[PDB]
Amino acid sequence: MKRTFQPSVLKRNRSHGFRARMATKNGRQVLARRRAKGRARLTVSK
Amino acid sequence: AVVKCKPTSPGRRHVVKVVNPELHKGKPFAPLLEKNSKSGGRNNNGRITTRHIGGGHKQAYRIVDFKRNKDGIPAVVERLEYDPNRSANIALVLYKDGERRYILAPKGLKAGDQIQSGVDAAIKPGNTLPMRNIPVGSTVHNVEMKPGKGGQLARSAGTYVQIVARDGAYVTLRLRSGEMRKVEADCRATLGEVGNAEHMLRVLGKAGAARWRGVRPTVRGTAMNPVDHPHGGGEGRNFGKHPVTPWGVQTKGKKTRSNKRTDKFIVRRRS
RNA sequence: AGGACCGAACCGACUAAUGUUGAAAAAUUAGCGGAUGACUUGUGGCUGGGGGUGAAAGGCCAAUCAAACCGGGAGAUAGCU
RNA sequence: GCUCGCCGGAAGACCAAGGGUUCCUGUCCAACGUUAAUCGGGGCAGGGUGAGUCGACCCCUAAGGCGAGGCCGAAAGGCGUAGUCGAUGGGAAACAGGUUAAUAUUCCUGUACUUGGUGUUACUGCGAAGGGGGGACGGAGAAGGCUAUGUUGGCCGGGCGACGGUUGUCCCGGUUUAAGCGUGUAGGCUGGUUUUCCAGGCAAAUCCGGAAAAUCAAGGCUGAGGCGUGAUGACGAGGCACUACGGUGCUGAAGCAACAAAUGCCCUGCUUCCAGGAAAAGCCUCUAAGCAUCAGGUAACAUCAAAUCGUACCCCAAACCGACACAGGUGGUCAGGUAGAGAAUACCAAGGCGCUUGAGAGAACUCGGGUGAAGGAACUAGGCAAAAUGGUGCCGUAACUUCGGGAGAAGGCACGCUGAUAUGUAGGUGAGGUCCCUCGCGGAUGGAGCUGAAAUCAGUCGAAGAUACCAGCUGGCUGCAACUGUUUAUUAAAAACACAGCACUGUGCAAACACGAAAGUGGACGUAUACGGUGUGACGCCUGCCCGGUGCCGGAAGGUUAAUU
RNA sequence: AAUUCCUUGUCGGGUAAGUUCCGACCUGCACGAAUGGCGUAAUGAUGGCCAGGCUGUCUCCACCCGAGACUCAGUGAAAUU
């Protein structure tokens, strides 16, 4: 049976990449929240 | 001509075709072609604004001259071609200077005929002149509502208009819908009528034929739930309310003309 | 010529048995329907929650839908256990 | 190591996506592996990925994204021009053989090709963000010419039989060779050359388009395969000796013909139909502003350069998506033999596997199958399930009907093997020879060789000859929906939803209508034979009476009536 | 009647025997003409009924071939309390 997760690197970066988050005001707030919490990985870039 | 298909299969029993052996059998004129991508009835917001649109065959756009502003240069007709963007046919005309253009095909036009435009052109079908130099009671098509903008009325397969009277700077015309409207006596018009009067006799014959045109199926409204349409549902078939659109408008006589900038050019609405 | 006919690939899911702490949070075995078309499939794109999409079942929108998920108002209120 | 069994349009081989050392060698057995384990995709250590030609990067653009100014909006922000990004598409060039425990069209041997920089020489109108050409495009169908590939003969090497026969019409194996360069065939398309003139291609133009004459009858473009060369080479069954019995070295025969034949190539072709079938650059060509003893352009020769990143391994699966070493899911490419219409089905080749607990016993009962006396639906809500029918040719076939159908209606007969007609027939393919020629990949004649249906007659074996796998049960009456289609992913596939057709009604274009505080966008680059909404639902015969109520569409005397004053 | 409560209405056909099925009658509880009426060839994994063939569906079960169940060795769960 086909499952929900079908990986694709190109689509992953275009949806949750670092540059995608920096292109919108709300996206930049996501980075600020994660920086405050001290996350070791901010995005899914690598 | 009109030909009825034989009933060799369910789907061809009720099919009626319109065939014209005079149409060109080949590729169109490349220099007058353009790209034309489909939209699916969605606007720049990505939302559906016109329902029942989607799919169909790929099409290319032909540039048609609706202005006819080449005066004093006779042109000859080369061939008649099929146009998928409109119900009427088009013709390729070659001018003396060596230019080519597309025009709507009048009723009795054929290869070898000559056409001209201006104020000194002869009164023959296919010629374009300002309406001030057209005898009253004549039949014309491709009429402009403003001098120089281009033809906008009577452009369908077999439509035409008739000049009724001329008082001053304006003239009175009777449109195909029966409306009586007046326009300035400077707009150009073409003699004759559009030459595809048999286009109304076609019968698609099956659901698939409509899908080729890009028309998607229509859901009535009594078959939905009340959360989707005012006609809603019920145990069985009830429909105990006045007919109404989605969004709540009557649809059985209610008028929806609220311009108020026109009506100085309307004489009799219609009917 | 054909939303034509028989029938594999391919796409579907009408009947029965098994399974039901299953091999599997919907599958297996034997039959079954369509199979040049309103067909099917790869890659990328667009539509966002009282909104979308819907050949229309209140269907589907990440195993969740008569109003998704996450955080917040928040220790909502509970004449009831 | 020897037998046995299984897959073989895969359970074989090569990739993309995804994963990220799972690849190779040595070593270890605690944990991990549904058992043991000396073994492992497990632990530890070392080793392994070599490119001017393959891919990315790069040049060009589609849907779409962002968007200097700009327009709009309480703020945030929205839309969009010039531009700039974005493949799933377009754009230069490498083939064969050999080699590592693990990489190769990348290393080695042999033989090739493409695009640029610089220099020299000869001859010279070069020049763009502009014009034109080209690139450049659909579905279905048909025939011919070919190759991949297979079969048989010939040729070369070897063999004479564990049990009757086997020196012949006997048995086994091999019989392979590229890119490039030269030739330009089957076949497809288009008449060619010269002079003069012109409201068009925003300016210009020798280019494109158009007009009027002269002069000739063959010029040009595209094009699979074959042949020659590449090749006195490479490869090659078998041998001869060394050999830590892992394998290392030298040598080397034949290497031809006929027939059959694709879903691949000629073919982006040809014929035909209506639903009428991307864009831009590279490339070719003409000129403007400019520069002309320069600069640039064409040709030959020499020389230099072609960077950077990916390259191991799995990839229908134990390595990817499913919590698992999980009977599930996952796109592209390659396509042998016998029988067969076939990529179905059965048995096999190359190749790969026996699925990570076994050993005994032969109770009830459960699961998956085989057979059955007499009866034959008496079973049951219901013929649920099971049994049965099943192929090709010929004969034959009802009511009804929209004249197409119904129809494979129903039903009946014949099917193996051997010989003859004919030492292999009809047909297909086609050598030698001869004749002619503008002699060439030519034409006519000619028929050797090879390949090979179907039918008739006679005979013959068995209970059974469409013998296995494979492979329609049929007929009669009737409700509903015309029909093919669509739907509750995971208890409902239907009489429900679509549907062609029909009617009413709105809409004159800055259209009605819809998404948006707005700008704007869709409707539509459409114009009443058009578009939106509503009901009905092929087709045939038809669709009656009622305007008091509610709604909608008109009317104007009078009554009542808001802000304001 | 996909519509009929009384109702298994009455008559005829089919069966040895038919609350279903087919054809008529009209007392239509409570059909009816585009939320359409009455017909209709072809089509349907659609609802109801009757035949031929066929059979372990059944009278009524019997035997046989395989995988479990049972015994031995290794590993080693669960609901509940």
Side-chain angles (χ1 to χ4, degrees):
Chain A
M1 306 171 66
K2 186 169 183 176
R3 291 268 108 87
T4 47
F5 182 54
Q6 304 299 331
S8 174
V9 177
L10 178 59
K11 295 217 287 184
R12 186 169 187 75
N13 291 342
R14 280 182 176 173
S15 306
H16 323 290
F18 177 82
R19 303 199 95 242
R21 291 265 153 86
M22 290 283 302
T24 285
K25 183 270 307 203
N26 292 318
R28 291 195 288 277
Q29 255 144 27
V30 167
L31 303 177
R33 286 203 300 273
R34 291 176 82 79
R35 279 203 180 94
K37 196 177 189 183
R39 288 274 188 185
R41 298 201 281 300
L42 293 180
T43 59
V44 315
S45 290
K46 296 285 271 286
Chain B
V2 181
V3 46
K4 211 195 163 34
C5 291
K6 281 190 168 186
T8 61
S9 173
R12 299 278 288 188
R13 181 184 292 285
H14 306 295
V15 169
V16 179
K17 299 164 72 175
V18 171
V19 305
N20 194 6
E22 283 184 348
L23 299 186
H24 181 50
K25 291 177 176 178
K27 302 299 179 221
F29 202 54
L32 297 170
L33 290 179
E34 250 181 31
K35 186 174 81 73
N36 196 22
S37 266
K38 297 152 154 22
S39 57
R42 293 142 166 84
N43 74 332
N44 61 349
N45 278 337
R47 304 280 192 83
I48 292 167
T49 56
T50 312
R51 311 182 302 171
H52 318 327
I53 297 171
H57 204 112
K58 197 194 224 178
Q59 300 172 334
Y61 184 73
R62 276 78 156 163
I63 295 161
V64 179
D65 177 19
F66 290 114
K67 292 187 176 182
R68 301 290 303 282
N69 48 22
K70 281 262 279 187
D71 316 348
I73 302 143
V76 74
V77 180
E78 298 227 86
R79 70 209 188 196
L80 310 179
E81 295 191 1
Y82 176 88
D83 194 343
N85 299 280
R86 61 196 71 259
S87 56
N89 294 317
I90 55 175
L92 186 66
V93 304
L94 170 56
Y95 286 80
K96 297 289 228 53
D97 47 359
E99 213 191 304
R100 287 191 170 82
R101 293 193 178 186
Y102 275 126
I103 56 161
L104 296 172
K107 191 172 186 299
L109 203 75
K110 74 202 196 327
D113 294 21
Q114 312 225 357
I115 58 171
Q116 190 166 3
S117 34
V119 292
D120 40 304
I123 298 286
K124 309 150 64 283
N127 295 348
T128 309
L129 318 98
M131 271 185 280
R132 180 172 323 242
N133 323 112
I134 307 295
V136 174
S138 267
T139 309
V140 297
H141 70 272
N142 197 40
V143 189
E144 329 185 352
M145 311 179 78
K146 271 165 166 175
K149 172 143 72 162
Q152 290 172 279
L153 312 166
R155 273 161 47 163
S156 195
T159 49
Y160 61 91
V161 302
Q162 210 195 144
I163 298 164
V164 175
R166 170 163 25 135
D167 193 330
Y170 292 76
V171 305
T172 313
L173 325 161
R174 172 174 24 218
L175 309 184
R176 195 70 172 77
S177 61
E179 179 168 301
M180 288 259 173
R181 167 155 188 160
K182 75 204 308 196
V183 303
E184 292 179 62
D186 282 353
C187 311
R188 287 157 174 273
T190 307
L191 282 292
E193 328 161 32
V194 191
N196 205 12
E198 40 277 26
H199 161 263
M200 70 203 303
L201 304 170
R202 73 174 52 270
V203 184
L204 306 190
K206 59 163 178 173
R211 305 300 304 272
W212 301 338
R213 312 301 221 283
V215 181
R216 272 175 60 74
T218 297
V219 192
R220 275 175 284 131
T222 35
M224 320 182 170
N225 299 297
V227 69
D228 308 297
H229 203 278
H231 294 177
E235 293 283 61
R237 319 179 165 136
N238 301 135
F239 197 90
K241 66 215 85 179
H242 295 118
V244 128
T245 66
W247 313 288
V249 192
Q250 210 243 356
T251 67
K252 291 285 173 176
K254 202 177 196 309
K255 302 179 182 294
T256 64
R257 172 170 226 279
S258 94
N259 183 273
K260 195 127 73 171
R261 178 171 53 85
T262 66
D263 316 329
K264 54 160 63 60
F265 314 121
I266 315 303
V267 191
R268 278 215 323 253
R269 272 290 287 160
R270 59 177 201 263
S271 188

